[PDB]
Structure 1
Amino acid sequence: AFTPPTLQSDTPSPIFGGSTGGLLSQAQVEEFHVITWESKKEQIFEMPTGGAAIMRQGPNLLKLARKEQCLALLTQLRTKFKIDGYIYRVFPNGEVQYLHPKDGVYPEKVNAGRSGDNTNMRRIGQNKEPVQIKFSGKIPAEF
């Protein structure tokens, strides 16, 4: 079994001068994501919102408007720095949902113990014709 890591709120943030591409009004009333990673030295990386930031030694904490920004930062950390990280979904009511490394290992590597949903056992051309599903509220591929 695998347990998700807790979001340690009192985690230091990278050195940054302040951008205009950061959080907006969506964070207060819908959602804002957050990414946490461990860096082995003080070095400069690129923000998903524009500009350069310096992440510090040890834990680094960065909140972002969208999950795609968090994954862009994570993939640039993994490629240009060989640094893994954790992404969390933080609701404004207080509940925090763990996100990307959901079962510990990365999704491109098998784990034996995942849900194989949305996997049809037919070919592309074996879907139903749209006339046979007429007036149903579903596309032919989700039958």
Structure 2
Amino acid sequence: TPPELDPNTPSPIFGGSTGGLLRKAQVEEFYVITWESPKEQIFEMPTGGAAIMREGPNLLKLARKEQCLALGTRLRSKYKIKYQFYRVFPSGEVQYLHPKDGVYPEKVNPGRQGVGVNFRSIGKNVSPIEVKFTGKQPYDL
């Protein structure tokens, strides 16, 4: 399924904080998290102190993503809300990150394909010497 897109949606009421974006946002990346609010509410900002949610669609730009999930996770519990966040880049391309597959990651989805799973579990990995000089690493196997 296709992800949502945006964006022209308004942002929450805040007064300004020092935890805000920096040059990294300008030249590397920055993130946006978006959500729908039922009421105009007050929430704790990860970067700053306190901000007011705006009823209806809401848009917030944060640096680092983890900030995005930390706020988003808080949004899911505390109040019930549905949220999504994207990676902006500087060119203008945008990238949908979470959820990314319809459903949340906790819940098993059939579309998903495994990455980085070793079927010989255990600590049945080989000694480092065995791969010595082989670009490989024991876990990679």
- TM tier, smaller: over 0.9
Paired with 2:94 and 2:123, the residues of 1 have a C-alpha distance of 41
Identity of aligned residues (%): 72
SS in 1 for 2:76: helix
**Which residue in the other structure is 2:2 paired with?**
3
**Which residue in the other structure is 2:68 paired with?**
70
SS in 1 for 2:123: helix
Deviations 1:101-130, CA, capped at 9 Å, x for gaps: 101100000110112111110123211110
Paired with 1:101 and 1:74, the residues of 2 have a C-alpha distance of 11
**Which residue in the other structure is 1:38 paired with?**
36
TM-score w.r.t. length of structure 1: 0.95
Write out the 4+ residue segments of structure 1 that deviate beyond 6 Å after TM superposition. none
Paired with 2:110 and 2:64, the residues of 1 have a C-alpha distance of 29
**Which residue in the other structure is 1:54 paired with?**
52
Judge which range, 79-88 or 129-138, deviates more. 129-138
Amino acid at match of 2:82: D
SS in 2 for 1:45: strand
Paired with 2:11 and 2:115, the residues of 1 have a C-alpha distance of 37
**Which residue in the other structure is 2:120 paired with?**
122
Q: CA RMSD in A?
A: 0.8
Paired with 2:122 and 2:98, the residues of 1 have a C-alpha distance of 29
SS in 1 for 2:9: coil
Matches within 5 A, 1:98-113: 98-113=96-111
Amino acid at match of 1:95: E
TM-score w.r.t. length of structure 2: 0.97
Deviations 1:39-80, CA, capped at 9 Å, x for gaps: 000110011102000011100100000110000000000111
Paired with 2:98 and 2:120, the residues of 1 have a C-alpha distance of 29
**Which residue in the other structure is 1:82 paired with?**
80
